[PDB]
Design a protein around this ligand. Sequence first.
Ligand SMILES: [Mg+2]
Ligand SMILES: [Mg+2]
Lengths: 444, 49, 96, 29, 16
Amino acid sequence: NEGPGDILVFLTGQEEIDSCCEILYDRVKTLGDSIGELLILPVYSALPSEIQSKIFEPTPKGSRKVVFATNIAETSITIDGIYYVVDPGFAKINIYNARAGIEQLIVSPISQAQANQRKGRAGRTGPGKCYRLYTESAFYNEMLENTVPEIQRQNLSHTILMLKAMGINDLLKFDFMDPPPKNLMLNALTELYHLQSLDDEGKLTNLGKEMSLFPMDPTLSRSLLSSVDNQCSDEIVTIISMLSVQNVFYRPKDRQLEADSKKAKFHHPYGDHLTLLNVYTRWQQANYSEQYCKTNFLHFRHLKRARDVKSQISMIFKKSDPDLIRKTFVSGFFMNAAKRDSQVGYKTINGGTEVGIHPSSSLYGKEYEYVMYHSIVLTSREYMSQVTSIEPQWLLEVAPHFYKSQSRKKAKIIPLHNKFAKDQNSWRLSSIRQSRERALGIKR
Amino acid sequence: DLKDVYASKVRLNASEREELALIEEAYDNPHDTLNRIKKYLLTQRVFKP
Amino acid sequence: DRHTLAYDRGHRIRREFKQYSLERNSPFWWTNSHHDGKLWNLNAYRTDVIQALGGIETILEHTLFKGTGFNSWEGLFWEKASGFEDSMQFKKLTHA
Amino acid sequence: NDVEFKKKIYLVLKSSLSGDEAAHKLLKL
Amino acid sequence: NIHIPRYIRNQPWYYK
RNA sequence: UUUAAUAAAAAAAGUAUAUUUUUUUUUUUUUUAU
Ligand SMILES: [Mg+2]
Ligand SMILES: [Mg+2]
């Protein structure tokens, strides 16, 4: 019931975009009488480039085109023909809890600036329409004023290294426009202290300066220093190249199980990091071909970027035992480790957070007792990512300074569960006492 | 298997209440009673009737 | 809970030798339900006896159900609490 | 007439712990 | 109903 | 081809205590932006 022009529908996540596009396609299959055609295009982050290019297509035959998109159409996209906009006003923010140790992806309401960019994306041609399901006073009052800071949002363990290598002796001497809470900055400085890059005096070490000279993550930079010292460099740097790039594997709906067979063909049972060596050595043995990573669903953008990053790291260097590789990663990642508990699955070494293995990993159907995880995501369930088997000898010989009872004393046990008892405390002498004194009718 | 005897009855003579109290204590602080078992397996050699 | 029953070894003989250290014996000294399952089921016997006696009509013409005046036999089934004797079985009470 | 007959045959068949005993009862019918 | 047992809710074979 | 059919109640004084066979496990593959 409105004029012609392309439509941009502001959505949140890939599952949400897929479900809304499916419901709209089922509605367009229902509305088969005197309705204009609705060309559908979804826009997600890790979408294929041939399928990410389809959003810029021409309009239908006298009819409407609709791009169901995430926040990518906020500032880094420019679609032609857009005359309509429907904005629900929600996004996904990455909130990093440092003391807990994880990062949550939480749905957040849009501020004034993001809603302004969404309303301004409607008028790239001329007089368009912006429909945002909100009252005007509600959109003015309940929405946040300006953009929230990236210093207060993400992990500051990387930028604190650069501001320390600059030479600022105090944190408030930097005097940012929107400073983070110093709990987060103090935890980031604590982690960078534990990585042996910061000395006890508060100044950067010589190896701390050498690791601050690197562009990677500071735990990855410590693993780089270890791979330089222990002469096992090239495979370590290859795994760091596969790590710094986003996830290589693709999961379609038509070819899901064949992609599962390709993943099962790839992955090494010692860990998940070694599978990335298998993928990189397979792509280098294939001489960066298109048919090989087109069958095995390895993304060519991500594979070429991994090649570029590995070549970049070898150039900035210029100016196959699994055991040494894994120990070289212990040198970087001794902090984020996990202990397999039989009752609750996995406990964290720091804080005791009940975490889990993601099913897309290599290590899902299998179990090892002590594992270290590269990343961790707070969602409906915790998930660890890039999980490798590890031995506690390595976690001691690398870090005798983070650690070397009381938890044994505070523990308790409960008997085996039976179905027939209907209350598994009624065997006790206290419960027999209470049932006796209730049947007699006294009351304490 | 020590608990399994007392699943049935609610009328208890004092010896059974003594056994159930010892079982409930051993369930409540398990490391302490386990350490006690480790001590008795080493330095006890004269037993009761 | 199978992960803590992976450690219970030697259990048939442990269950058999309870005759020398327990007064109240057990008839099922040979099976252990956690390790071995429910090896028998007698639910259909209670269905076929009611067809054997002729049904709820030919059972209830023997009983005193007609004099109570419930509407239906289906209300014979409740979570019946004992009341008096439940209170009285715990008291200090003579042998006689 | 069919259902009550199946019930009589089933109840004959479903006592009588031997095959010879159920065969005796059914040939006695 | 919740109260009736499963030996009464079951119909035998020959009522099927 | 033919045939085997037990029982059946009054009075007096008692009695320890636990005894059990009965219904699936819950294990979900999703991470905003490059
Ligand atoms: Mg007398
Ligand atoms: Mg006498």
